[model samples]
Target: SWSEKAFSASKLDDAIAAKFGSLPIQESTAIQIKAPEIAENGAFVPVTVATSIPGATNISIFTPANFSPMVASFDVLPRMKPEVSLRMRMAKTENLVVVVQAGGKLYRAVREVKV
Candidate 1:
C-alpha cells in the first residue's frame, strides 16, 4: 500500500471544506514542517506536516499567510505514518496550516517560518 496523490487548494478545496466543515484553526498546537533553516534557493522548500490528535484523516499546510491560506493537504490513514514530507515553492516566510480529521470532524493547528 502507498500514499494517495496530492491536490491543489482549488481542486481539493471542496473535499477539504466538506471534510472540515466549520472547524477553526488555532495557534499553539504542535505543527511539524521541514523547511530549510536557511535556503540559498527561495523558490522551493521542503515542507512536512505532523499532528497529535484523534482521527487524523487529513492534514493541510498554507503559506505566506497572505495567499488563499492553503498550501498543501495530506490524506492520512490509520496505518499511515504520522508525518508527511513534501516540497513547496515560496517567495518568503509564510504561515502554514496542519489539520486533522477525526470522528468525521476537523481540528486544526498552524505555524509560520522563513525559508
Candidate 2:
C-alpha cells in the first residue's frame, strides 16, 4: 500500500518525504484541523480535517514527536468532500500535523496538543 512506508518511517520528515518526495509543502489557512488543546486521554484523541482546496485527492495525519509519526492517511474520491474525521492515539504531547494533497500540490496545517 502507499501508506506502508509512511507509517513505518521513524521520523516525521522521513514519513512526509516518503509520501511526497521533495515536493514543497505550503501552510494554508484554507485547511481546517479541529482538535482539542489538551486531550484527557492519550490513548484516543478526536481529530477532524477539512479543506477547501480544489481537487483534493489525499489527506494524512501525523504526530511529529512520536516514534512512528505517521498516524493515518486517506484517499479522497472525486465525489467525496475533502474531509476526514477520526480518533488517533497519542503517546505524548505533540504537534498534530495534517497534510492535504490537491491539484498535485501539498498543503499542510498543524495544531499543538497536550496529553
Candidate 3:
C-alpha cells in the first residue's frame, strides 16, 4: 500500500519537501531509479527503485512532475526488500525520488529522466 501524496511541478523537490516538511536536502543518489533517460515508448515505461540499505520496510515512488507527484508507495511487510516498481506518466523529463522510512526515520535517494 502506497501513500499517494499530492503532485507538484518540482517532483523531486516536492516529494522531498512533502516528507521533510521544508528541510534542506542532503544530497543522496543512493536510491537510483532504474529507468532510461530516453524512453522508447513515452506513453508507457517501467520504473524500479533499488535501495542499498537492508531491512527496508516500505518503498514509495514519487513523480513531482505529474499532476500528482506521488505515483505510488508500498507498506513493505517483514522480510521485505524495501523496494517497489511502478509505471509513471511523463509529460516530459522529470525527477523521481524514492524514500524508505525505516527504524523510525526517513532515508532517501533520487534519479532523473527525460521523456
Candidate 4:
C-alpha cells in the first residue's frame, strides 16, 4: 500500500518527495490549514484542511517532528470538495504541513502547533 512507504518515511522531505516526486510546491492562500496553536494533547490533535484549488485530487498531512512525519492522506474524487478533517498524533511542537494536488500542480500551506 502507498501508506506503507509513505508513513514509514522517517523524514518529511523524503516522504513528500517519494509520494509526489520533485514537483515544486507553491505556497498559496487558497489552502487553509485549521489546527490549534496549542494542542493540550499531543496524542490527538485535531486538524482540518480545506482548499479552493481547482481540480484538487489529493490532500496530504504531515507533522514535521514526528518519527514518521507523513500523518495522513485523503483522495478527493471528481466533483468532490477538497477538504478533510482528522485527528493526528504529534511527536512535538512542529509545523503542520498540508499539501494539495490540483491540476497537475502542488500547493502547500503550513500551521504551527505547540504540544
Across 1-115, the per-residue lDDT of candidate 2 in tens digits comes to 2364354334767788887787888998978999888887658888888888788888888876666667888887754776688988777777778888888799998888888
lDDT (tens digit, per residue) of candidate 4 on 1-113: 35644543347777789779988888899888888888775488888898888888888888755666678888877557666889877656677888888888889888788
Candidate 4 pairs with clashing backbones: none
RMSD to native for every prediction? 9.0, 6.2, 6.4, 6.1
Candidate 3, 1-115: lDDT as tens digits: 0233333444567665675467543444556668877865457778888665556576677766566667787776646555566776676666677776655556777777766
Off by over 4 Å in 3: 1-30
Q: Which residue runs of candidate 2 sit more than 4 Å off their true CA positions?
A: 1-10
Q: For candidate 1, give the lDDT of residue 46.
A: 70
Worst lDDT window (10 residues) for model 1? Answer: 1-10
TM-score of each: 0.62, 0.82, 0.69, 0.82
Looking at model 2, residue 106 earns an lDDT score of 93
How big is the positional error of residue 112 in model 3, measured in Å on the Cα after superposition?
0.8
TM-score of 3: 0.69
Answer with 3 or 4, whichever has the higher lDDT: 4
Cα lDDT computed for each candidate against the true fold: 0.58, 0.79, 0.64, 0.79
**Model 1, stretches more than 4 Å misplaced?**
1-19, 24-30, 64-68
